[PDB]
Amino acid sequence: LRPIATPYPVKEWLQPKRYKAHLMGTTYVYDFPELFRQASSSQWKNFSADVKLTDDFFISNELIEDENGELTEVEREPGANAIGMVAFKITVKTPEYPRGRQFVVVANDITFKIGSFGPQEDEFFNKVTEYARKRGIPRIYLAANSGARIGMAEEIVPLFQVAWNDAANPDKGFQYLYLTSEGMETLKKFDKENSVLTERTVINGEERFVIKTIIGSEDGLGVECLRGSGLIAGATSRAYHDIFTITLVTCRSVGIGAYLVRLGQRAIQVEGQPIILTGASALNKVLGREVYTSNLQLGGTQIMYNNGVSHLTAVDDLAGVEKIVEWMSYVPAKRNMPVPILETKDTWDRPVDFTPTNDETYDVRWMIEGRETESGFEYGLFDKGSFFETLSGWAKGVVVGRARLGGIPLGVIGVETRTVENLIPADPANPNSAETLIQQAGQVWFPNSAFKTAQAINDFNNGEQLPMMILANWRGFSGGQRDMFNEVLKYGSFIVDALVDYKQPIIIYIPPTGELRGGSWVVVDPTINADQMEMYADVNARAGVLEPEGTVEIKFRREKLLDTMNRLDDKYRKQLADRERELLPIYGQISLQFADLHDRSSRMVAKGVISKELEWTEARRFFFWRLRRRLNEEYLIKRLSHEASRLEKIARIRSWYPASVDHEDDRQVATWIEENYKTLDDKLKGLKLES
Amino acid sequence: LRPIATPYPVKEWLQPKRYKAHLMGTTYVYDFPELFRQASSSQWKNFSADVKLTDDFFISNELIEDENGELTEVEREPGANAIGMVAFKITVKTPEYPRGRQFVVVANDITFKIGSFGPQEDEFFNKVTEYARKRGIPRIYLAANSGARIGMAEEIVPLFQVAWNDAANPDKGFQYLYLTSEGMETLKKFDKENSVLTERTVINGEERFVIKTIIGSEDGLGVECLRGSGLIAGATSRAYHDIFTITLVTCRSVGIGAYLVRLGQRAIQVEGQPIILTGASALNKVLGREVYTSNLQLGGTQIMYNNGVSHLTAVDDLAGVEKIVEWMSYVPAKRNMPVPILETKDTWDRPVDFTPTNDETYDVRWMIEGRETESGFEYGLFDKGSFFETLSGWAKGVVVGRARLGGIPLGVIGVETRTVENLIPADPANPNSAETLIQQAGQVWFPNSAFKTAQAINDFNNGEQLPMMILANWRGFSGGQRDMFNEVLKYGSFIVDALVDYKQPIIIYIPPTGELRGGSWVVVDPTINADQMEMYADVNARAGVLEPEGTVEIKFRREKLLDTMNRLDDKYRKQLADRERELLPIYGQISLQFADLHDRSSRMVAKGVISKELEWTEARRFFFWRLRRRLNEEYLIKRLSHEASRLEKIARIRSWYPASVDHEDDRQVATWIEENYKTLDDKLKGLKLES
Numbered sequence A, B: 001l002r003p004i005a006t007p008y009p010v011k012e013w014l015q016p017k018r019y020k021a022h023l024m025g026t027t028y029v030y031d032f033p034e035l036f037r038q039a040s041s042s043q044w045k046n047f048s049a050d051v052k053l054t055d056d057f058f059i060s061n062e063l064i065e066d067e068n069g070e071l072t073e074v075e076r077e078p079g080a081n082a083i084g085m086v087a088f089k090i091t092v093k094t095p096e097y098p099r100g101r102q103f104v105v106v107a108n109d110i111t112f113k114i115g116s117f118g119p120q121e122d123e124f125f126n127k128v129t130e131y132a133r134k135r136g137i138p139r140i141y142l143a144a145n146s147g148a149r150i151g152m153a154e155e156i157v158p159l160f161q162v163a164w165n166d167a168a169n170p171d172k173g174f175q176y177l178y179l180t181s182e183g184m185e186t187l188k189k190f191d192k193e194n195s196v197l198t199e200r201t202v203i204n205g206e207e208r209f210v211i212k213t214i215i216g217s218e219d220g221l222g223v224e225c226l227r228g229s230g231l232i233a234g235a236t237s238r239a240y241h242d243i244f245t246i247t248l249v250t251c252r253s254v255g256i257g258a259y260l261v262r263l264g265q266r267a268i269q270v271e272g273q274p275i276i277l278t279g280a281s282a283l284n285k286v287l288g289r290e291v292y293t294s295n296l297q298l299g300g301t302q303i304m305y306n307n308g309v310s311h312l313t314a315v316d317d318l319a320g321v322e323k324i325v326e327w328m329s330y331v332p333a334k335r336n337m338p339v340p341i342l343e344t345k346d347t348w349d350r351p352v353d354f355t356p357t358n359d360e361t362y363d364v365r366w367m368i369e370g371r372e373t374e375s376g377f378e379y380g381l382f383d384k385g386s387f388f389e390t391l392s393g394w395a396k397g398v399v400v401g402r403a404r405l406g407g408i409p410l411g412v413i414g415v416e417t418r419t420v421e422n423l424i425p426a427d428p429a430n431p432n433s434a435e436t437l438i439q440q441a442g443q444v445w446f447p448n449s450a451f452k453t454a455q456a457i458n459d460f461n462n463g464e465q466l467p468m469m470i471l472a473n474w475r476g477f478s479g480g481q482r483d484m485f486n487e488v489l490k491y492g493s494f495i496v497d498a499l500v501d502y503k504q505p506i507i508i509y510i511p512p513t514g515e516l517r518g519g520s521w522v523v524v525d526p527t528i529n530a531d532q533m534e535m536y537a538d539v540n541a542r543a544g545v546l547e548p549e550g551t552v553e554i555k556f557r558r559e560k561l562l563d564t565m566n567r568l569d570d571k572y573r574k575q576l577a578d579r580e581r582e583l584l585p586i587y588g589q590i591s592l593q594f595a596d597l598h599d600r601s602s603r604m605v606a607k608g609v610i611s612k613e614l615e616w617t618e619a620r621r622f623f624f625w626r627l628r629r630r631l632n633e634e635y636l637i638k639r640l641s642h643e644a645s646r647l648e649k650i651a652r653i654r655s656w657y658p659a660s661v662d663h664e665d666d667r668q669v670a671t672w673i674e675e676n677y678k679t680l681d682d683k684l685k686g687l688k689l690e691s
């Protein structure tokens, strides 16, 4: 025992495995539920400081497989795990779910066989994933591993013989490896008969049993670990489309561990903990040369957070847990449950303070969450303090995160107007490679920002099951050679595919000072998914096939300009070229304003390509009731689905509204539905007996 | 008329639009059905030279919208199209479908308003896509366009007035644009009243109608073209998952046209025809400098074929059509129809001649399709002349194409063992940018090859609805810094996602000289999709978590080596370090062979991670009956699905087999099912009345 004379018992001594985990730079597996309790408790303090919490607000039960291989809840002492994979079912009362919400936490035990994945770990992880999926509850994975378990048939090591070319000279080589009849008998004695595949021969009176295949008696040596790896890869891929999946990389994550991080999609990387495929030393051995210095050079946050593999970084394990808990606060308690409403001090009924200007540079986050000024706080479109940005280290041209609109959680996509630089590090394997700095213009989709946009759309849809708002402000895609070669078309197409798959309401809003041109409009038009999408343009937004300069270049040419001087200029109506030379600068501007007068929200309304033109200051009030109304109608459409189109379903639901309700008034419709949920339920139940 | 005195009529004069299309370097739209007839006729000649074709073997009917907007077949003279989008329903008797197969061909008319997409073109394209989808038939798109239609309100051009700052000095600027009461009256006269949005004011007795928004009387000017663009983007995204989709880029393809190429996925690019987003000239205007020289520098085959955007290139339009027709020959006639069997001279019953060797370099295509040698033709695994390679210009480390196995069409994925170089061109926008040459090791998945593998899997599954074979031979993924930074994990994960979605039989086969290690095995294990996947290893293949060198480094260390000399070496059993120094080279090799003896197909069978170990020479005979048996059982499983698991369904089907049939004999099972299809149908019909 060390240290001696401590006020309370030494936990690292009571359970020596706690100390091993600490030595390896991570939280001991059985101490993670405590971090969840701490993080959950902080969630309450930051929400309502006055709240009194008892310990019944949080329950953690370890899940273990029974005799029949069925998962069951147990209360046992930490460190009694027979396998290197552990799980807990957590029930927590949270501000969003005061009566309680559940989730499963699966974790590798880094103290058990270096946190390697053997077949039993692989089968348990899969069983826990299925348990979560069946229940529709979130699956949190805590990665601290060494990848697939590696081994050799240790019993064949002290028994094998080598059939030398020349017994006297071993350096002359060998023909094969074999067993003596004494060796075979050792195996027959210990029942490990099937540990080898032998072909018997006779060489100089001696009977040799030639080793044709070494199998081993111990399970978890090779290909059986790889089968399990593939099994848990498939399971995680499936879970991502079914439940909320998140991973915290808490110590290193290797091989299958790295793939699991990615297949679960949403990931938080603790600083200094690498996500690697093959270690740096092994790569150097393969390369001959000493190319790489460390594993963090390969999979640190400097790589993975900049890649977009890691959605967020965390200073330590508790910060990682706090981030999980915060992310979860926007997510339904279980699959197909409503999005968790959480109204705070910042209510729906207020105008939007922060307003962008054409003449002044801004951070889109100010339009989202507001900004601190010397003269007080300027409120943005969403609730103060509700913006939770993710994928912040990658493709910084698009801003993605979760927010709240009068308590309603949703995913937000905004456009960074400022030029963005990214540093491509120098390739250690190429001596003629130097670090490159890429600069990307604002309001233009590039391969990385198009990929991030599509990724965001998918991560909001799958598991999170959230509505979304896109503050659409793009000039188009980078049409240049480098970006065309870097497959900008491929990533742009993923955006369309993500919108087609979207199952919750979408609001596309061209904000003030915002634009949407040819290429950018195509990829975000509400006709991509009419069932879920609707578009709105601010009165101070612009949209058209080309930018005005482009339109004038194709349709307001010199002949048309001169015919305009020959109409508007008295003096003009070699004596001409002197007049032309003085008028062209202003007559250029006149055509440029003529083109711009077509690019207005009023044209968009006239042509019926947008639902409404809006005033930025009044957007929060409008979107709160439009979103609330939309969630209520969507609920009614889902209930009716228990064989008709959406158009027929919504017509039927709206035929139930009193004759006096204006179908175009969002507040009235939302208010009526909420006042009549049980009445509407009775109606629905009456229709069920009619099918 | 020119030329004069030709033997037959001058078609380019009879229809002047034919000449315009030719001048622009493309086939005239109405002449494409003829290219399909020519290509289809060649298909027959290359199959059976003796066949006699009449003109009834091929029918092409133009599809046009009727009064109610419903598509109908018409016989009219070319060039009578009121819109710039045309379609044909083609019915062709082919070697695979001698009684006929159908498909729709949609094409832009480059002679109609430069092949721009206006709302009517967008609505027609969408109607044709829906027509194809409803019928389950392939949709061929021929791209020859200028993107979304651009325009201005031409009627407001001769009427607008400018409200100058100083009437005498125009160069001093202006305040707004306006209309006179005479201008307003011109609009009122021609009914174009709603062409402008005006706000009336009085300035110096004069009544000015200030232009607040220019709308226009003509449809197809701006945002209405963008709405249609998004509509056809969504439709194509959807079609790709539903029917066989292919695009031939026959003249330039711009903006929405470029996205359509990509959303349809499968594309053939005619040499010299660019796929661009923004033209080179417009980019230069935006850039200030003269950065780009041509549109082919941005979207030529040098870009798109090297990207993998273009699956194939074609010398001219007929070569493009021939490639469509050849690709289609592997595809079912309509959605959910069986894969088209086409038995040729090269029958199933033969061994595989071409065999790879460890000591000798080979082209994987020889293992696939065979090779010509001086001593005659060495047959490969698949039918002679059946390999149709696609994505040949991109990520040349993986070989992807369609082939036939005794007539059965399937998708093939093979590993290029040779080192692959690719040339990244120099960025014209960066003066400090020089062309880079990347070299990639064989048998290693890199970001591009992992992406190509996933892409291949998806393109075989969607629309093509084919079974697949992967000749799995990878050491793993590139774990190095450059490839980790270039998101190798992301692309590796797409492989898993593609396999999870696979709906047809899959065969994973580790070939002779082939390997599958830690990282590579995870992503292709049959437990990712147990319902469709099965794995096989050649007797001369290897598999384990690490390569032998890796295994020895972790589990056969110095203490273990010395304990082996202290057991096997009489002389060994400062007098030691001299012995150690002489024995370590051979004792290294002994441990290296000890590790390798675990990496065998016999271990794979023992541990039950593979279905069977195989002999390469006998693989064609085995896979032909295994695949045939699998297609028959899959058919029966689909019929039974008209509420149980797959395991229950296949148990039921196999309970119908006579007691004497061996469920493990593929040939016997396939033979019995094919002899009893109608008998099994009767059984199925009897069960229907029991639900």
Ligand SMILES: Cc1cc(C(=O)N2CCC3(CC2)CN(C(=O)OC(C)(C)C)C3)cc2cn[nH]c12
Pocket (backbone or CB within 6 Å): A441, A444, A475, A476, A477, A478, A479, A480, A517, A545, A546, A547, A549, A550, A551, A553, A554, B278, B282, B283, B285, B286
């Ligand atoms: C002057 C002018 C403009 C546009 C237009 O509408 N653009 C918007 C889309 C872009 C291109 C200009 C901006 N994007 C771009 O790559 O910008 C980078 C900053 C290079 C990354 C593509 C069309 C035309 C046609 N003729 N003259 C035009």
Ligand SMILES: Cc1cc(C(=O)N2CCC3(CC2)CN(C(=O)OC(C)(C)C)C3)cc2cn[nH]c12
Pocket (backbone or CB within 6 Å): A278, A282, A283, A285, A286, B441, B444, B475, B476, B477, B478, B479, B480, B517, B545, B546, B547, B549, B550, B551, B553, B554
């Ligand atoms: C010697 C040795 C080998 C392996 C092994 O199994 N590898 C297979 C997978 C690779 C890495 C070596 C090959 N890949 C690679 O990047 O190869 C490039 C050519 C660089 C592109 C990753 C593991 C270990 C562990 N200790 N010592 C090892």
